[PDB]
Amino acid sequence: MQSVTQLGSHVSVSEGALVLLRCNYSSSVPPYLFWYVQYPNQGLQLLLKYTSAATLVKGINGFEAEFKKSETSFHLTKPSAHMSDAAEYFCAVSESPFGNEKLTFGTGTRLTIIPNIQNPDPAVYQLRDSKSSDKSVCLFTDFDSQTNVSQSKDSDVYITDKCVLDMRSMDFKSNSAVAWSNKSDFACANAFNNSIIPEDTFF
Amino acid sequence: VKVTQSSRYLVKRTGEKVFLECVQDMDHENMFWYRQDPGLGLRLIYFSYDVKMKEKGDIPEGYSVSREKKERFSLILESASTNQTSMYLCASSSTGLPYGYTFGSGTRLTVVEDLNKVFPPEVAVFEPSEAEISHTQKATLVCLATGFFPDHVELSWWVNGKEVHSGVCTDPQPLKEQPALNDSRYSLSSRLRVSATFWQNPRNHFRCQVQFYGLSENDEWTQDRAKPVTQIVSAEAWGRA
């Protein structure tokens, strides 16, 4: 009889900070543990496997995990988190050293990595719709990672959460959120309102 | 060494009997069906350790299973509800080989209680602000995909007919256009950022590509709109000066 638990469904850390993902298990027999990663758009891929070979197990993409029998644990670590590390992680257990026979998985942990924005100039921009028709989106961009972005208050006005894009041409990251409507009173100098830094450029 | 599931998404109606297939080219004796739901990780429905064999997993209730040939494992939902709305995932393995599990790529199943609700997206692209170009010498295009149900879309960007990864962000989840109605349509935005030099060269082509997934050939339709099938809606803009 076997089971696995992943305390913490969501972990957010800073870029470059320590990553730690928990996994604990119960097993009436000798256990064998595994870590799987699931990157935004791909399938499940093996990160590392504990086999009885040794106690500290190294894996792919900078990860490591120590098998502690006394504790009941196989925690996943990486010293310096990279943006590319954003994904869901799954811990699993089997009665087979190779994980050939049935795996029992935990509940997963989604890892979110917070960008270090070095030189912020937050602003709000109006972009025109295409084929020379005029519907209006507002882009709130270039803000510090401290800034969160609340839901709308007006129902028929739409605001997305912040999102991070990584230009590797220029080694440059930036956060953004989108607000839009079709209502006559909608304008980009009042679509966002919520802990929004006083030094925003608005034109 | 691959495992392939018959479908990548399906839409199905409440009460309907449902059939997913899973095939493997590795001669594996072991085949397994899981489902994955947010907060619940992966849970084993049914497994099979040889041809003609089956055994219930942890959550067998409501599901059935068929291992007819060594290479294939069918999962059958007896009567579709929105408790079976989920992502399904097949895996196989060998008994003697030391390699573990190979996973399929999954099939997303969404069960709705009425089939005239499924819509494709339409896709607009919004060109950068000059204000942004001036202040930053960068340029951001926004793509909206709107009016889709269920939440089945895959949004991509193409620069001069070549998929781009660098400088992109797409919402990880969509907002509800009508967030009261039980089954409102969805909308999802995305961002492409390039240097102003790049945006300001008339030779450059930018395309927001959206693949949607709804109804197959088989499905009955005598409504007034285009049968909302699996399709790619794109949108387009050129470089400016």
Numbering used by the authors:
A (entry chain A): 0 to 202
B (entry chain B): 2 to 242
From the reporting publication:
The key molecular interface that enables T-cells to sense these threats is mediated by the clonally expressed T cell receptor (TCR) that classically distinguishes between self and foreign peptides. The TCR governs T-cell specificity by discriminating between self and foreign peptides presented by MHC molecules. One key feature that is likely to facilitate this level of cross-reactivity is flexibility within the TCR complementarity-determining region loops (CDR loops) that form the antigen contact zone. The finger-like CDR loops of the TCR are thought to meld around specific pMHCs, sampling the peptide cargo, and enabling T-cell triggering by ligands with sufficient affinity/dwell-time.
We generated 12 structures of the F11 TCR, that recognizes a peptide from the influenza hemagglutinin protein (PKYVKQNTLKLAT) presented by HLA-DR*0101 (DR1-PKY), between 1.58 and 1.89 Å resolutions; 5 structures of the DR1-PKY specific HA1.7 TCR, between 2.31 and 2.98 Å resolution; and five structures of the 003 TCR, that recognizes an HIV-GAG-derived peptide (SLYNTVATL) presented by HLA-A*0201 (A2-SLY), between 1.26 and 1.37 Å resolution. For the HA1.7 TCR, we observed a larger shift in potential positions for the Cα backbone of the CDR3α loop, differing by up to 5 Å. In contrast, the HA1.7 TCR structures, in which a large loop movement was observed, were solved at 2.5 Å average resolution. However, there was clear density supporting both conformations in the HA1.7 TCR structures. Similarly, the HA1.7 TCR CDR3α loop was free from crystal lattice contacts and shifted between structures. However, several other loops in both the F11 and HA1.7 TCR structures were also free from crystal lattice contacts and did not shift between structures. However, we observed several CDR loop re-organizations between structures for the HA1.7 and F11 TCRs, while all structures of the 003 TCR were identical at the level of the Cα backbone. Thus, we conclude that these loop movements represent real differences in the conformation of the CDR loops of the HA1.7 and F11 TCRs due to the intrinsic flexibility of these regions. Although this analysis is an approximation and should be treated as such, the average maximal loop motion was slightly less (6.4 Å) for the 003 TCR compared to F11 (8.7 Å) and HA1.7 (9.0 Å), consistent with the structural data demonstrating greater rigidity in the 003 TCR.
